C-alpha cells in the first residue's frame, strides 16, 4: 500500500488554513530530488511558508509538493519529493504534525 504521508499532509494543511493559521513546511534539504534555492538551506533543512498568499499554484500531490514562491523579490519554482517533507505546522503557535517515517521513503 502507498504511503499515508501525502494524505496526512493535505489534511493538516487544510485544517491549518481553515483555522486561520499559516502553514509552514519543514523540508529535509539533503533528500534526493529536493529542488529549492540554496540560500534556503540552513542546518540541512528548509522552512517554507505554504499559505496561498506566500505561494502560487501550490500542488500537494501524493509524490511531491510543487509551487512558485518569491525570494527577496525573485520568483522561483520549488519541487519537493514527499519523502523530504518532515513536518507541517502553524507559524502562529507551532501546532501541526511531525510525519512518521515510512519504509518507502528509504
Amino acid at each position: 500500500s502507498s504511503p499515508k504521508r501525502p494524505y496526512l499532509l493535505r489534511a493538516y494543511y487544510d485544517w491549518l488554513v481553515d483555522n486561520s493559521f499559516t502553514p509552514y513546511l519543514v523540508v529535509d534539504a539533503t533528500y534526493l530530488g529536493v529542488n529549492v534555492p540554496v540560500e534556503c538551506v540552513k542546518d540541512g533543512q528548509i522552512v517554507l511558508n505554504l499559505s496561498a498568499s506566500a505561494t502560487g499554484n501550490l500542488q500537494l500531490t501524493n509524490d511531491f509538493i510543487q509551487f512558485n514562491a518569491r525570494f527577496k523579490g525573485v520568483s522561483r519554482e520549488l519541487y519537493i519529493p514527499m519523502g523530504a517533507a518532515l513536518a507541517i505546522y502553524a507559524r502562529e503557535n507551532g501546532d501541526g504534525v511531525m510525519f512518521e517515517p515510512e519504509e518507502i521513503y528509504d
Binding site: Y24, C40, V47, N49, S53, A54, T55, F71
Partner: peptide, 8 residues
Amino acid sequence: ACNDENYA
C-alpha cells in the same frame, strides 16, 4: 520561512 510573505 525562506520565502517572501507575499508571492503576488
